[PDB]
Amino acid sequence: ALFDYNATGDTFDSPAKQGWMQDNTNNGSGVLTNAMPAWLVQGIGGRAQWTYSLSTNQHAQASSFGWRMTTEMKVLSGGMITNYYANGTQRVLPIISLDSSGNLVVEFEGQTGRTVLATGTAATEYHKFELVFLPGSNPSASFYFDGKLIRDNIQPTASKQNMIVWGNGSSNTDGVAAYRDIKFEIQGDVIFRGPDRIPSIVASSVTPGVVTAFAEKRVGGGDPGALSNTNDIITRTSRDGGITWDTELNLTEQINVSDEFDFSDPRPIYDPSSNTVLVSYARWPTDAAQNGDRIKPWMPNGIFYSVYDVASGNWQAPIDVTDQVKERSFQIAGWGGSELYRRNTSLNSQQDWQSNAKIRIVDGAANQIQVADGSRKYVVTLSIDESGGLVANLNGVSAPIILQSEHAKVHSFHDYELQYSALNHTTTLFVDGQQITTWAGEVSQENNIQFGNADAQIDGRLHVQKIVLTQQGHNLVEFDAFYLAQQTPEVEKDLEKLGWTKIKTGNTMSLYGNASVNPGPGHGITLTRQQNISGSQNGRLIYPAIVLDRFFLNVMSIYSDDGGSNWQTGSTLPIPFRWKSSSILETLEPSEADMVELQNGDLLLTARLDFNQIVNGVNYSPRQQFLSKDGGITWSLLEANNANVFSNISTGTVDASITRFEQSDGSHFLLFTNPQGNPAGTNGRQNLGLWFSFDEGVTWKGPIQLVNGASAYSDIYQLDSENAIVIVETDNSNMRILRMPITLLKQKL
Ligand SMILES: CCC(CC)O[C@@H]1C=C(C(=O)O)C[C@H](N)[C@H]1NC(C)=O
Ligand SMILES: [Ca+2]
Ligand SMILES: [Ca+2]
Ligand SMILES: [Ca+2]
Ligand SMILES: [Ca+2]
């Protein structure tokens, strides 16, 4: 909430015409002045000041969420120039004056001594005076003069005064000052009310002042997937930098006509090229979702986006991108074991045959597709090498073959075709129609087609969409995992019931997946520093989404290199595992995540780690950072870069936010928000903190406490050259707006 006085020239320029109450005594007075229009306070032989009354609830909001008072004035003479705020019990009182040398000085009630602010002709010229109050158990204000920190940790002092005040607050002491502008802002206006939840926010650089915020509208409350709620995506827009907001708009009820769905996790990206907001969100059937792993691949989970045209205020109807981002496959994780499927066949080695296998290599090695024709065996083994390239080894041939070096292509599906020539008794491998090589395989009496992960001592994971075997104009074998993966449970999908033999050693997991994809909470980004990042590009839209294969959550990039027309997925985060007992996996589950592009084009990602945090005695904490050096395709776990780097961060699991802040001089740093807990560094969703990184995410300074009270999910975005805007869940999950003077606050560090 903003309470202000602005002199414009309009002879409404009286503070009285702008809601202020004249409070003069004796000969105290005031008059409009126009050097540039201003109100001249004339506290000559009397008091001359202006006041504004606030409600109990307004004072309480100010106490819980902070406030700031900004004055542009010049002091002409005298003293007791008192611009301040008093809430009925306490106040922070700066007293500004000209001293006996004509120097402009300030002193504070409750602190010792004075500070010179300006000397010479500067003392009686206009300046900008800012008081910023940060809430907390032991709260304090800081005072700034033309943007520079003058005094910090100014603790409030007792006063029964109850008003916003500016001018010359003394009858017995002359003071004369001209005011161009007074702004008192109470932080924390409610923008979305609980039990709505899960906020995100972005701001338009092309149209300064435009801010677009999102949440889940939860009729009935609670997470998606409950029969007792119908959840939609809602949005509001500000055009004055987040002070006022237009009408709450339900973006998804138009595609939720029978309340058959829940939508969740609005993830906006601001696009400066089109000046648009593209917000992606999850769809779920209303009665099943991510919680409990209840969502299944045959159910209508997917991802849609809506586009806001900032220039017109138009919201475009939702667009479904589920087919592009929700993989359908049979997945074999040969992690600590091997798992192969073999279909015995009756190939005639004296006739040609052909096979096709559509396969994605997720990680590792010993991933195989094999055909044996009763005379010879042909095996292609697919691995990820040290530099993250895709490599083929053929049985009987010493030299490996590099198939791909570009990381997106390394982990995408490819068609592996074997063409056997009876005449030469050799087989030619084609990959995506490209002839790769010809080899003779090995002698064998086996007669089958076989695929999976082949070695219990070599970890690998491969996903399969199609397998075909053909001879003499007939398909002998056909397996369409892409089709089967999305069928309901009454369609037979068990390979062992479909004529395949399962050959498993040790511990493995396999499944048809994925069960769901979810953009996750917060916003995404457009990349602009990718020039020297091989295989990547500027203009990429990207966000870190949550994928559930069947039972385990993890994070992968979802991105578009054509402005949002077509979307692609990257690899999931690399995480440790351990089999604590047969078929019981100890591992991590990264879920709610946020990423930022560093100065060198590397991407820094911070992820909430849910459920178990400990693998082989190693505690990864409730939060873990990851780094991508290839534009978001693949990631690396940053050792010892977890919750530990955010001093006094809360110890409970919760969504966080991260973003880049750029100053007018081109300097930059990172901002991060998360509760501290109360006390700081304990469990609760209380006391939102702000952390800074001036070194590309290696260390973090802070926190600066932003909120005194409930603080759960949050999102932070740069608002302008000097401010960041924060949306944060608070009491009863009520989402509130903070507008934080970052360039001021950083000076407290
Ligand atoms: C994925 C993180 C977590 C796993 C327990 O679930 C989230 C936690 C939440 C929470 O801790 O408050 C609320 C989120 N809306 C929920 N996500 C979904 C899709 O229901
Ligand atoms: Ca409805
Ligand atoms: Ca529901
Ligand atoms: Ca987030
Ligand atoms: Ca699970």
Mapped to the 3 state alphabet, what secondary structure does 171-200 carry? CCCCEEEEEEEEEEEECCEEEECCCCEEEE
Q: Which residues are annotated as a binding site?
A: 197, 608, 685
> Is there a catalytic annotation at residue 262?
no
What is the helix (H) or strand (E) element at residue 740, kind and residue range?
A: strand 735-741
Under DSSP, is residue 746 helix (H, G, I), strand (E, B) or coil? helix
Q: Is the CB of 198 under 6 A from ligand 1?
A: yes
Angle at 472 between CA 470 and CA 474, to 5 degrees: 50
Q: What is the dihedral of CA 218, 221, 222, 226, to 10 degrees?
A: -90
As a whole number of Å, the CA-based R_g of the chain is 32
Contacts of 740 (CB under 8 A, 6+ apart): 690, 706, 723, 724, 725, 726
CB contact at 8 A, 494 and 484: no
Q: Which residues are annotated as a binding site for substrate?
A: 197, 608, 685
Q: Residues for the chain: how many in total?
A: 749
> Is there a catalytic annotation at residue 13?
no
| Number of Cβ within a 10 Å radius of residue 623 | 27
Catalytic-labelled residue, pool 189, 713, 715, 717: 713
323 token code pair: 């087919």
Under DSSP, is residue 313 helix (H, G, I), strand (E, B) or coil? coil
Residue from 445, 449, 606 nearest 521 by CA: 606
Ligand 2 center to 243 CA (angstroms): 29
Angle at 683 between CA 679 and CA 687, to 5 degrees: 50
CA 572 – CA 570 distance, rounded (Å): 7
Ligand lying closest to the C-alpha of residue 590: 1
Residue from 482, 459, 461, 504 nearest 331 by CA: 461
Ligand 4 center to 559 CA (angstroms): 17
Beta strand pairing call for 353-364 and 460-471: antiparallel
CA 703 – CA 722 distance, rounded (Å): 19
Q: Is the CB of 224 under 6 A from ligand 1?
A: yes
Q: What's the CATH code, domain 187-326+514-749?
A: 2.120.10.10
34 token code pair: 């126009």
Q: Is the CB of 226 under 6 A from ligand 1?
A: no
Q: Is the CB of 610 under 6 A from ligand 1?
A: yes
Q: Is the CB of 519 under 6 A from ligand 1?
A: no
Domain with CATH 2.60.120.200 in the chain: 1-54+67-186, 327-513
Method: X-ray
Which pairs from 526-531 meet CB under 8 Å and 24+ separation?
526/269, 526/270, 526/271, 526/272, 527/597, 527/601, 527/631, 527/632, 528/597, 529/597, 529/598, 529/599, 529/600, 529/601, 530/601, 530/631, 531/601
Ligand lying closest to the C-alpha of residue 548: 5
CATH fold label, 327-513: Jelly Rolls (2.60.120)
Instruction: Return the DSSP state at 473.
Output: T
Ligand 2 center to 258 CA (angstroms): 7
Out of 223, 612, 653, mutate this one to test ligand 1's pocket (max ligand atoms within 8 Å of CB): namely: 223
Instruction: Return the DSSP state at 485.
Output: H
Q: Is the CB of 223 under 6 A from ligand 1?
A: yes
Q: Is the CB of 216 under 6 A from ligand 1?
A: no
Contacts of 386 (CB under 8 A, 6+ apart): none
Out of 287, 294, 591, mutate this one to test ligand 1's pocket (max ligand atoms within 8 Å of CB): namely: 591
- Omega prior to 318 cis, within 30 of 0: no
Pick the atom of ligand 1 nearest to 518's CA. 19
Under DSSP, is residue 357 helix (H, G, I), strand (E, B) or coil? strand
Q: Is the CB of 291 under 6 A from ligand 1?
A: yes
Catalytic-labelled residue, pool 271, 417, 446, 592: 592
Q: What's the CATH code, domain 1-54+67-186?
A: 2.60.120.200
Pick the atom of ligand 1 nearest to 198's CA. 15
CA 462 – CA 370 distance, rounded (Å): 14
Neighbours of ion ligand 2 (CB under 5 A): 253, 259
Domain with CATH 2.120.10.10 in the chain: 187-326+514-749
> Is there a catalytic annotation at residue 223?
yes
Q: Tell the residue nearest (CA) to atom 10 of ligand 1.
A: 654
Residue 48 forms beta bridges with which residues?
24, 168
With breaks defined as C to next N over 2.5 Å, after which residues does the chain break? 11, 35
Q: What was the resolution (in A) of this experimentally determined structure? A: 1.9
CA 502 – CA 331 distance, rounded (Å): 14
Q: Tell the residue nearest (CA) to atom 19 of ligand 1.
A: 290
Catalytic-labelled residue, pool 72, 174, 223, 373: 223
